[PDB]
Amino acid sequence: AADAATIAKLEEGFKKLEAATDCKSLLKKYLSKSIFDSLKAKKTSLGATLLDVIQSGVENLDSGVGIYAPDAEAYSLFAPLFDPIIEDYHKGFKQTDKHPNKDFGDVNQFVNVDPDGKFVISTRVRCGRSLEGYPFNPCLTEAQYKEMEEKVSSTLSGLEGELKGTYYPLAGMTKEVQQKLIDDHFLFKEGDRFLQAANACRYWPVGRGIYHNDNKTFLVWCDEEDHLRIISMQMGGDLGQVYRRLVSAVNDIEKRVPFSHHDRLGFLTFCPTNLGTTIRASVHIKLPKLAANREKLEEVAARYSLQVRGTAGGVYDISNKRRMGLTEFQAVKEMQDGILELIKIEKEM
Ligand code: NA
């Protein structure tokens, strides 16, 4: 039951989208007049409206996707918009498909993809989580940011063993502590115009924080883009160690804070293109000879749905694109298999 002022801003926003005949966003592509009319008066029980979904793509016509989720209910209430956009971004995940239940699988199956260290500089696996009961960034209140951060900081400061470490609130953070975290690439800052316009940076830095373990192989960001961004990383190619550490950590956190999960979409986050497993595994990897014939490399990468990015020579950031319609085990295994074949190729050239 959106109020009249919301609906008036929505009608303005739809006409802005309609006027931008060259706009290429998925918002513009899929927000048809009939979907728009169907959804524009709806409101979630936490007060979120279609405006809290689409405003960033209305303000930033040059968005690629142009929608965000303001709370968990929004994915169901505004499914007629989210569903085709998710299908377009994750090809083959249809509006009638169902993301499988969580399955980290047999974690002992994951290996060091580069034992002698000659290829993989470093390995990272991250996931995202929303805490059950809280809205997402566009709708969190200042009080909720504060309360969530107390819950999360207490949870992280209780981690033991390899995961033991230090929580740093962004509120009140000194310049020297900022520099210390920057030097480890652990700091985050306010987001750009796409996130500002999604109302995702309100009350900054309240409720935002950074945790890492003593070994600097585990990093958590609290209320950056999602409630929790949980990262496991280390030098070398032991994706198996990285993954098992991530799984241990996620399970330990879940004991204290339950996560938002959706039967069709998997783990729910603020970004609709990071649902499902929410998992991004990546390596920084030196493939000089395969760089001398990138058409082969893009061919192999494509059949593992790997994104190959340059980040120095033949050094690549290679990560998995898939999130939907596969398990955590399948996603990481597709990554592992992809890197193992790329390395087998490189050595034989
Ligand atoms: Na393949």
- Report yes or no: 95 and 84 within 8 Å, Cβ to Cβ: yes
- Cis amide prior to 205 (ω within 30 degrees): yes
Report the distance separating Cα 148 and Cα 130, nearest Å. 11
Q: By the 8 A CB rule, do 276 and 325 touch?
A: yes
124 near 282, Cβ under 8 Å?
Answer: yes
> What's the CA gap between 274 and 33, in Å, rounded?
26
The verdict on 203 and 294 lying in the same domain is yes
304 CA to middle of ligand 1, Å? 5
- 204 with 283, same domain? yes
DSSP string, 31-100: --HHHHHHHTT-B-TTS-BTHHHHHHHHH-TT-SS----SSHHHHHHTHHHHHHHHHHHSTT--TT--PP
In a 10 Å sphere around its CB, with 0-12 CB exposed, 13-18 middle and 19+ buried, how is residue 21 labelled? exposed
Q: Which residues surround ligand 1, an ion (CB under 5 A)?
A: 303
What distance in Å separates the CA atoms of residue 132 and residue 90, rounded to the nearest whole number? 25
115, 185: one domain? yes
Give the C-alpha separation, 107 to 243, whole Å.
Answer: 7
Instruction: Report in angstroms the alpha-carbon separations of 7 from 30, 40, 79, 174.
Output: 19, 6, 18, 43
Q: How far is the CA of 338 from the centre of ligand 1 (A)?
A: 7
- Helices 79-89 and 51-59 pack at an angle, to 10 degrees, of 50
Q: Which residue, chain included where needed, has tokens 């609290």?
A: 222
Report yes or no on 101 lying in a domain.
no
Tell whether 159 is covered by a domain: yes
Contact 336, 282 (CB under 8 A): no
202 is in an annotated binding site: no
Is the same domain home to 41 and 135? no
By CB atoms closer than 10 A (0-12, 13-18, 19+), residue 53 is buried
Structure tokens at 82: 């989210």
Q: Are residues 133 and 79 in the same domain?
A: no
Q: Give the DSSP H/E element, type plus range, for residue 320.
A: strand 315-320
Q: Does 64 show up as a binding residue in the annotation?
A: yes
In a domain, 45, yes or no: yes
CA distance 349 to 329: 30
In the chain, how long is the greatest CA-to-CA distance?
Answer: 66
E-strand stretches of 198-314: 209-213, 218-222, 228-235, 261-262, 266-267, 280-286, 306-310
Q: For residue 100, tell me if it sits in a domain.
A: no
Contact at 8 Å (CB) between 241 and 233? no
Question: b or e along 88-113 (b: 16 or more beta carbons within 10 Å of the residue's beta carbon)?
Answer: ebbeebeeebebbeeebbebeebebb
How far does residue 319's CA lie from ligand 1's centre (Å)? Answer: 15
* 177-199 core/surface letters (b: 16 or more CB in 10 A; e: else): eeeebeeeebbbeebeebbbbbb
Count of domains for the chain: 2
* Rounded CA separation 76/73 (Å): 5
Question: Are 63 and 168 within one domain?
Answer: no
* 120 and 75 in a common domain: no
Sign of the dihedral defined by the CA atoms of residues 23, 325, 126, 260, in that order: positive
Cα–Cα distance for residue pair 323/262, rounded to 1 Å: 14
Question: Looking at the domain assignment, is residue 283 inside a domain?
Answer: yes
Per the structure block, which two tokens stand in for 299? 């061919």
Residue 194 three-state SS = helix
The reply to whether 175 falls in a domain is yes
305 CA to centre of ligand 1 in angstroms: 9
Separation between Cα atoms, residue 88 and residue 24, nearest integer Å: 13
Q: Are residues 80 and 124 in the same domain?
A: no
Judgement on whether residues 61 and 150 belong to the same structural domain of the protein: no
Question: Given 39, 54, 89, which residue is the final one in a domain?
Answer: 89
What is the span of the domain harbouring residue 313? 107-348
35 has binding-site annotation: no
Same domain, 123 and 22: no
This structure was determined by X-ray
d(CA 107, CA 26): 36
3-state SS assignment for residue 216:
coil
CATH number assigned to the domain comprising residue 222: 3.30.590.10
- Establish whether 253 is an annotated binding residue: no
Whether 98 maps to a domain, the answer reads no
Please give the distance, rounded to the nearest whole angstrom, from the Cα atom of residue 87 to the centre of ligand 1. 22
Q: 309 among the known binding-site residues?
A: yes
52 and 174 part of one domain: no
Q: What is the token pair recorded at 162?
A: 């390899």
Q: Give a yes or no: residue 102 inside a domain.
A: no
Resolution in Å, one decimal, please.
Answer: 1.6
* Alpha carbon of 79 to ligand 1 centroid (Å): 32
Q: Tokens in use for 69?
A: 């989720």
126 marked ligand binding residue: yes
Q: Do 252 and 51 contact (CB within 8 A), yes or no?
A: no
Nearest to 89 by CA among 60, 74, 67, 111: 67
In angstroms, rounded to a whole number, what is the distance separating the alpha carbons of residues 164 and 143? 28
Query: Residue 134 and residue 46: Cα distance in Å, rounded?
Result: 9
Alpha helices in the chain (DSSP H): 4-19, 26-30, 33-39, 51-59, 72-77, 79-89, 142-157, 175-183, 193-197, 239-256, 288-291, 294-302, 328-348
Query: Which residues on adjacent β-strands are paired with residue 267?
Result: 261
What CATH code is carried by the domain that includes residue 55?
1.10.135.10
Breaks (C-N over 2.5 A) in the chain follow: 311
Question: How many angstroms separate the alpha carbon of residue 334 from the centre of ligand 1?
Answer: 8
Final residue of a domain: which of 34, 54, 89? 89
For residue 232, the SS3 value is: strand
Helix (H, G, I), strand (E, B) or coil at 212: strand
**Tokens, residue 143:** 């009080």
